[model samples]
Target: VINTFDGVADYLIRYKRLPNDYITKSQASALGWVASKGDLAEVAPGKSIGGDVFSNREGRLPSAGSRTWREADINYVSGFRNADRLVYSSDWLIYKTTDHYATFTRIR
Candidate 1:
């Protein structure tokens, strides 16, 4: 899962070919919930018990899984939940949403 900032960097570098220096300190915040995509919708309402099921859910239902509660908690604590806007530097993936609680598009 896309759980850590390093993980996000690794994925981007591996799959998206994002340069190492492409992401700066100011842009790091945008990586908070990078791994929360997939079948997150099923888990968004807190229906599941743990994140272990999230991987399986994504595999089984690509369009369903939501960010694990732990991840969401991390985002909240990391200031992502309250962020007014998110900016990614590698490919300049910028996202702004009024409904930060429900929008998971940028996570991927």
Candidate 2:
């Protein structure tokens, strides 16, 4: 049941990937996720670093269809949660941020 940035990154670097996590808007909605509500802490637990949609509104990542986006959470420690999260797509496109979604790095 592990789903952290390091977990996913290390897995990708070492083996491959988790295939995928539920990304349809309602899947997130069923998990009690709402934009800027911090409800993920309750629904996803340590997995806040994963799941949910990664709206590439700024075109920060490569262009894709609206539904083509998926995201993971990042920098969430054992007892702390912050703005840090990962933005990615279904085709393994990924990004990172320590200052929330303020910046990113294009990682394949």
lDDT of each: 0.30, 0.59
Compute each candidate's TM-score over C-alphas. Answer: 0.23, 0.57
Clashes of each: 8, 3
Candidate 1 lDDT at 92 equals: 30
Q: Model 1: how far is 16 from its true place, Å?
A: 1.4
Q: After superposition, how far is residue 101 of candidate 1 from its true place, in Å?
A: 18
Tens digits of per-residue lDDT for model 1, 1-108: 342344543555466533232332223334432343432223232221111112223222223233322121122223123433222333433222234324434543
lDDT of each residue in 32-56, candidate 2, tens digit only: 7676666655776544445556666
TM-score of 1: 0.23
Residue-level lDDT for 26 in candidate 2: 66
The per-residue C-alpha lDDT of model 1 at residue 36 equals 37
Error at 58, model 1, angstroms:
36
